[PDB]
């Protein structure tokens, strides 16, 4: 359902990345059914682990307070969101994803500890 | 499934002669295959539950199976296929054996 507006500009994707979003509602065929269902469950669980671990949990447009060193990218907002699409951006930051995920997790745990200790 | 407007010849290694050539149809030609050779099958017991069915004597007249092809439509389709193959084969004279 997310395939819509794939080739569109990033702004149109963002206004569309929430237009479908999600409508929801021994035999070899049974084996295929079971494999497919388990695989889908695993992918959904993986995505939810990453989201909740970054503190996003159940939010679609998730914010974060991580800075943006000019090492993953050096282009400025307007060109990122106009001279590009989502697949182009993912290819641009393809092999920085692991470092970015690690930095997100560290920032989340840092802020969580900070708020817990300031809660006094 | 039929094509959309023309004949599509798709092959992995068109240059190679050891790879089969697949042709899609602009339009389909109907064929009629029948066996007007009325059978009388009979089952025999060859074991505890093993029932073997064998061909008995053909009652009535005896006939041989055949398939009917519309000659004009088939020839037109083959000519279109050859014409579309010629461009892929440097406009050579296409012959079917």
């Amino acid at each position: 359902g997310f395939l819509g507006a794939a080739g569109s500009t990033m702004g149109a994707a963002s206004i569309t990345l929430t237009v479908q979003a999600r409508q929801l509602l021994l035999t070899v065929w049974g084996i295929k059914q079971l494999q497919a269902r388990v695989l889908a469950v695993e992918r959904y669980l993986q995505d939810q682990k990453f989201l909740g671990l970054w503190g996003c949990s159940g939010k679609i447009i998730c914010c974060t307070a991580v800075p943006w060193n000019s090492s993953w990218s050096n282009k400025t907002f307007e060109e990122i969101w106009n001279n590009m699409t989502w697949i182009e951006w993912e290819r641009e930051i393809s092999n920085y994803t692991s470092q970015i995920y690690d930095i997100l997790t560290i920032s989340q745990t840092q802020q969580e500890k900070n708020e817990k200790d300031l809660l006094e | 499934s039929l094509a959309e407007e023309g004949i599509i010849i798709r092959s992995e290694n068109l240059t190679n002669n050891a790879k089969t050539i697949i042709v899609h149809f602009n339009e389909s030609v109907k064929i009629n295959c029948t066996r007007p050779s009325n059978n009388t099958r009979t089952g025999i017991h060859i074991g505890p539950g093993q029932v073997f069915y064998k061909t008995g004597d053909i009652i009535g007249d005896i006939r041989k199976a055949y398939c009917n092809i519309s000659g004009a439509q088939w020839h037109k389709v083959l000519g279109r296929v050859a014409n579309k193959l010629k461009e892929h084969f440097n406009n050579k004279t296409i012959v079917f054996k």
Partner: nanobody, 130 residues
Framework: QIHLVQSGTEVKKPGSSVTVSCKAYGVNTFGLYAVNWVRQAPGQSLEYIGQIWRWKSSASHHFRGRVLISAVDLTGSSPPISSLEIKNLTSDDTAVYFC??????????????????????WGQGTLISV
């Protein structure tokens, strides 16, 4: 596997036209693949002329109205071929010409990026002089 062979070497005169044909052996189609033309001056860094990427001819900034790119896909006997056409040749064009082909089927391979791309395969080269 992937073998790139092209025409031989010859000497021409200024103001003439040169046609260099590059034959691609092992390349299925020029739709999935992309052929790039690069020139290496004698004892000097390389230079990029242009390309025909999925049937889209292009050329460098200096090669405007100067170079033409042609490409023919699989045939019955001949392999896919791409030809290099240059006109109004001058004394500075005397260099070896290279035919380069790379696969663009996979977008995450990293060999290609928005038309500009690396050169996975190379030809033997054609020496050109006046």
């Amino acid at each position: 596997q992937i073998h790139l062979v092209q025409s031989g070497t010859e000497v021409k005169k200024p103001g003439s036209s040169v046609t260099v044909s590059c034959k691609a052996y092992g390349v299925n189609t020029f739709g999935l693949y992309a052929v790039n033309w690069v020139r290496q001056a004698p004892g000097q860094s390389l230079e990029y002329i242009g390309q025909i990427w999925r049937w889209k001819s292009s050329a460098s900034h200096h090669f405007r109205g100067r170079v033409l790119i042609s490409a023919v896909d699989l045939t019955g006997s001949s392999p896919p071929i791409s030809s290099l056409e240059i006109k109004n040749l001058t004394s500075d064009d005397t260099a070896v010409y290279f035919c380069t082909t790379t696969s663009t089927y996979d977008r995450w391979s990293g060999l290609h990026h928005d038309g500009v791309m690396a050169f996975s395969s190379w030809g033997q080269g054609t020496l050109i002089s006046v």
